[PDB]
Amino acid sequence: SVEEYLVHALQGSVSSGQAHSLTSLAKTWAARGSRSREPSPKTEDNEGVLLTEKLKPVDYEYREEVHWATHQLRLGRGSFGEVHRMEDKQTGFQCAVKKVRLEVFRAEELMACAGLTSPRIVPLYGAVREGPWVNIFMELLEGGSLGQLVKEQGCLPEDRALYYLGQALEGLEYLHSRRILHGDVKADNVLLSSDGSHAALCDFGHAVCLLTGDYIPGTETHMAPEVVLGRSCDAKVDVWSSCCMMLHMLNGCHPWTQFFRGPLCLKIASEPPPVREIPPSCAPLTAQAIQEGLRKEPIHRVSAAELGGKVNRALQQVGGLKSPWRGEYKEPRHPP
Numbered sequence: 486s487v488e489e490y491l492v493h494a495l496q497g498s499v500s501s502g503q504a505h506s507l508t509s510l511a512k513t514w515a516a517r518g519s520r521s522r523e524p525s526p527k528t529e530d531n532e533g534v535l536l537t538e539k540l541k542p543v544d545y546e547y548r549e550e551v552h553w554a555t556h557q558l559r560l561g562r563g564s565f566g567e568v569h570r571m572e573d574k575q576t577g578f579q580c581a582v583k584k585v586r587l588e589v590f591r592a593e594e595l596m597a598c599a600g601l602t603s604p605r606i607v608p609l610y611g612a613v614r615e616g617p618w619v620n621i622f623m624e625l626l627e628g629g630s631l632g633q634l635v636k637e638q639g640c641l642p643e644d645r646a647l648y649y650l651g652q653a654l655e656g657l658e659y660l661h662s663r664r665i666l667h668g669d670v671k672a673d674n675v676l677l678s679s680d681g682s683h684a685a686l687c688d689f690g691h692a693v694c695l696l697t698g699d700y701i702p703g704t705e706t707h708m709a710p711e712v713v714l715g716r717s718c719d720a721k722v723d724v725w726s727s728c729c730m731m732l733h734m735l736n737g738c739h740p741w742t743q744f745f746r747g748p749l750c751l752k753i754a755s756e757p758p759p760v761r762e763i764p765p766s767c768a769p770l771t772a773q774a775i776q777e778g779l780r781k782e783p784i785h786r787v788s789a790a791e792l793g794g795k796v797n798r799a800l801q802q803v804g805g806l807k808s809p810w811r812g813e814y815k816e817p818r819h820p821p
């Protein structure tokens with residue numbers, strides 16, 4: 486009766502509003518893309534909610550080509566849609582737009598980040614639907630992804646690795662305390678500011694709003710053992726995946742991939758945690774932090790807050806962030 490009337494009032498219109506309005510409407514989109522395809526009307530449905538004065542609807546409409554447009558080439562591929570730079574034609578403000586087909590759209594894409602006030606989570610500017618297309622609007626982060634920095638740099642020095650992992654665990658701590666599982670923590674889903682000083686989580690395509698059995702695992706190399714074994718999953722899956730991302734930043738390669746072929750699910754269930762992939766040259770507190778994040782039993786695995794403390798303390802132990810922003814190529818680990 487509360488959500489039922491809110492969505493009835495919001496449907497068929499683009500409005501300026503709050504997170505709860507967008508979130509409520511997003512659930513009806515997730516359900517629509519489950520239904521069988523219908524014949525399209527003359528004028529497409531246009532509905533949704535903009536959360537910033539930077540993106541202004543015009544007579545309750547916000548349509549691509551008319552009110553805003555993408556310019557230049559794509560920022561990349563998210564789990565469920567391509568991402569572009571866009572500009573509101575009225576206000577001139579630029580942002581990022583992810584374009585998701587309705588039949589692959591999960592409301593958790595917006596529920597996980599709508600109205601969250603963390604510097605470690607990419608701000609959501611709103612989302613608008615044009616018939617079978619959901620446009621998700623977010624703050625533009627000029628530095629690109631951590632995943633792209635690792636490809637370009639080969640791998641990162643320990644202090645830079647620790648610094649970004651630290652900022653990611655602050656993000657994960659904020660989410661976990663609000664019963665949100667990210668579900669795809671990897672370097673590709675961390676974005677950097679232009680000076681490389683700020684990191685923020687993006688792409689909540691795999692998010693669940695909580696223990697659960699509905700978790701769609703992302704990248705097989707970053708999956709926690711409890712996921713593979715088809716067991717109950719909590720926030721700890723994100724802690725495991727964050728330490729897989731750490732191994733990736735230090736080594737320049739995903740864990741497992743340089744030692745095993747075929748589907749890795751079996752190997753992740755059967756093998757010891759990939760603690761052997763920890764560089765011998767790493768500081769003791771660094772190795773201890775990754776070891777406690779890569780415990781196979783989730784109950785014994787440290788929390789995002791706990792790993793965050795250890796990682797902050799590991800960064801102090803190596804002298805803090807000294808390494809330069811976009812330094813010289815560092816050769817990734819060779820296969821054996």
Ligand SMILES: COc1cc(C(=O)NC2CCOCC2)ccc1Nc1nccc(-c2cnc3c(c2)[C@@](C)(CO)CN3)n1
Pocket residue numbers: 559560561562563564568581583607623624625626627628629630632633673674676687688
């Ligand atoms: C200038 O800004 C950006 C530049 C670049 C960039 O240089 N790309 C080059 C890299 C080399 O190949 C060609 C393209 C990337 C992101 C930017 N900013 C940005 N800002 C907000 C959100 C998002 C975003 C949201 N959800 C995402 C992603 C990104 C994915 C695709 C990131 O992997 C995954 N899901 N991204």
